[PDB]
Design a binder for this molecule. Structure first.
Ligand SMILES: CC(=O)N[C@@H]1[C@@H](O)[C@H](O[C@@H]2O[C@H](CO)[C@@H](O)[C@H](O)[C@H]2NC(C)=O)[C@@H](CO)O[C@H]1O
Ligand SMILES: CC(=O)N[C@@H]1[C@@H](O)[C@H](O[C@@H]2O[C@H](CO)[C@@H](O)[C@H](O)[C@H]2NC(C)=O)[C@@H](CO)O[C@H]1O
Length: 516
């Protein structure tokens, strides 16, 4: 089924509508005339759809008509500009890098009084190490502006300066990136002296991981403990408490983790170490067969998804009742997940007929993937237009559909069919599992690709033997989306294996992550 640009302009803005516009663009079916008013028809004007629309109607990067005159000057003529213009252009470190030293000296004097931030950056670029100058001034705004201009600057930072960095918005991304990418060793070492009192949440957690990479177990514990107290989400507290336990072995930390309301690999593992029973899994078995809702209409999903996410408790009860059927099971569970404020464990097995002939281990891996990929929503579409329950990228759906399986009249929209999503999932998982073995490694490869995963596993510091392995390697997976994905799919895998009467101890999975 196709949609002309004119039928799509009549639908609500949504990722479904973006997907179908992008499909017209990649087939060259959007004329220059069709492309005129088309910005106002796009839900998320980012990535492929934007670079594709800009091949037709290039945009000039809007500069505020207020400062338009300020962008007629260059480094050769900036001294002929009024003071407002001078200060605007000096927002760019590249512009500053481009000026000659004499003009940097001049502008530094102009701005010493009302803008010492600018004076500091101008005089810093008159030296061969701008970072060393900014660090000596303990200018925090300047530090992050330089870091963002170039990652290559690296210097030791003293205790007074590191303890100021966390008060700035940039700190979280800065800490996450240098620790996970293993860049800026002098920055990394310096961050050992951050007082756990001056950090919280993700920044506290990554500083714990940092402290472990230097075998500073006392500092790591203090950071993870501050992470555990401050984190909003129970899943992240559990991750932090797991590290407090693994470092200092207080049996109270392990008890608190085994009693967690969050079902995740850390609480599952703690329950197994304390002989605590498996957590309660909800049984969803609606008597009603189907309803008037089309589970194959991607537009219908985007509309009802928006409704559900914006529903008061009362509206959730009306929706719970409409969607309490076997054909709309995945939407029922989505509504109940919200209606019970994410307190109950829902692990549905919808369109089960399509997978009952696979062995129970494979069933559990497929179900684990689909639950995290889509929550079993057949017309699920990602911001990168991954499609259906198993979230295939088009290139991959088409490679399997046309080139490998030669399905007649194949279209990538077939990924919206449960029969197809499950079938393609099985096929793709066979390819990944034959090369990778561990379901955690398959999870990384499924989300981030097998190239990425082979490159990570080849490193001699990832998933090798060590004190805190394999748990530390799972915190050092370089692509964040893939690091979170693996943990979540692993937990899902453990649960589905349990529901299918094919239980495995998560301790066996952790042992098989270490390469012997
Ligand atoms: C915190 C969390 O796990 N959030 C879930 C989302 O991640 C999930 O979206 C899916 O995430 C995958 C990576 O984990 C992507 O590969 C996948 O394309 C993406 N799917 C969609 C539809 O964007 C959503 C799915 O409903 O649920 C969140 O709870
Ligand atoms: C289910 C799905 O569509 N997964 C996508 C990944 O497959 C994809 O990774 C790439 O997959 C190719 C097909 O097997 C590999 O040949 C390729 O090497 C791999 N890329 C890398 C960097 O390893 C990723 C990103 O392209 O997106 C997923 O959604």
């Amino acid at each position: 089924m196709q949609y002309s640009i004119e039928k799509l302009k009549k639908e609500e803005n949504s990722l479904a509508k973006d997907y179908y516009i992008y499909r017209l663009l990649e087939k060259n079916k959007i004329s220059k005339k069709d492309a005129q008013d088309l910005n106002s028809h796009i839900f998320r004007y980012i990535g492929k759809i934007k670079s594709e629309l800009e091949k037709i109607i290039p945009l000039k990067p809007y500069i505020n008509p207020k400062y338009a005159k300020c962008y007629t000057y260059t480094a050769n003529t900036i001294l002929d500009a009024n003071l407002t213009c001078q200060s605007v252009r000096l927002n760019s470190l590249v512009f500053i890098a481009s000026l000659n030293s004499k003009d940097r000296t001049t502008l530094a004097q102009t701005f010493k009084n009302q803008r010492p931030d600018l004076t500091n950056l101008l005089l810093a670029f008159n030296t061969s190490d701008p970072m060393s100058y900014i660090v000596q001034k303990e200018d925090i705004n300047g530090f992050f502006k330089l870091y963002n201009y170039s990652k290559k600057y690296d210097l030791d930072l003293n205790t007074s300066l590191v303890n100021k960095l966390p008060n700035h918005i940039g700190f979280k991304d800065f800490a996450q990136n240098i620790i996970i990418k293993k860049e800026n060793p002098k920055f990394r070492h310096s961050m050992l002296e951050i007082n756990p009192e001056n950090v919280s949440e993700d920044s506290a957690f990554y500083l714990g991981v940092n402290a472990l990479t230097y075998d500073k177990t006392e500092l790591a514990y203090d950071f993870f403990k501050k992470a555990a107290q401050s984190f909003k989400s129970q899943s992240n507290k559990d991750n932090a408490i797991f590290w407090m336990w693994l470092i200092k072995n207080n049996e109270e930390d392990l008890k608190t983790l085994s009693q967690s309301s969050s079902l995740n690999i850390y609480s599952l593992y703690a329950k197994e170490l304390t002989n605590t029973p498996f957590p309660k899994i909800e049984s969803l078995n609606p008597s009603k067969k189907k309803n008037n809702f089309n589970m194959q209409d991607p537009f219908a999903w985007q509309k009802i998804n928006k409704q559900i996410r914006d529903a008061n408790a009362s509206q959730l009860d009306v929706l719970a009742k409409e969607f309490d059927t076997q054909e709309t099971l995945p939407i029922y569970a989505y509504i109940l997940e919200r209606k019970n404020n994410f307190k109950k464990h829902y692990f549905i097995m919808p369109y089960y007929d399509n997978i009952k002939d696979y062995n129970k281990t494979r069933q559990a891996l497929i179900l684990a993937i689909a639950r995290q990929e889509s929550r079993f929503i057949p017309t699920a579409i990602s911001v990168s237009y991954a499609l259906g329950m198993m979230q295939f990228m088009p290139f991959l759906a088409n490679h399997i559909g046309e080139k490998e399986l030669k399905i007649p009249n194949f279209d990538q929209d077939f990924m919206f069919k449960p029969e197809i999503a499950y079938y393609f999932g099985n096929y793709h998982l066979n390819y990944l599992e034959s090369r990778l073995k561990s379901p955690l490694f398959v999870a990384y490869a499924y989300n981030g690709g097998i190239g990425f995963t082979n490159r990570m596993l080849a490193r001699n510091d990832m998933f090798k033997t060590g004190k805190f392995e394999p748990f530390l390697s799972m915190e050092l997976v370089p692509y964040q989306e893939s690091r979170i994905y693996g943990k979540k799919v692993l937990a899902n895998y453990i649960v589905y294996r349990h529901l299918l009467n094919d239980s495995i101890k998560i301790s066996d999975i952790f042992e098989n992550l270490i390469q012997n």
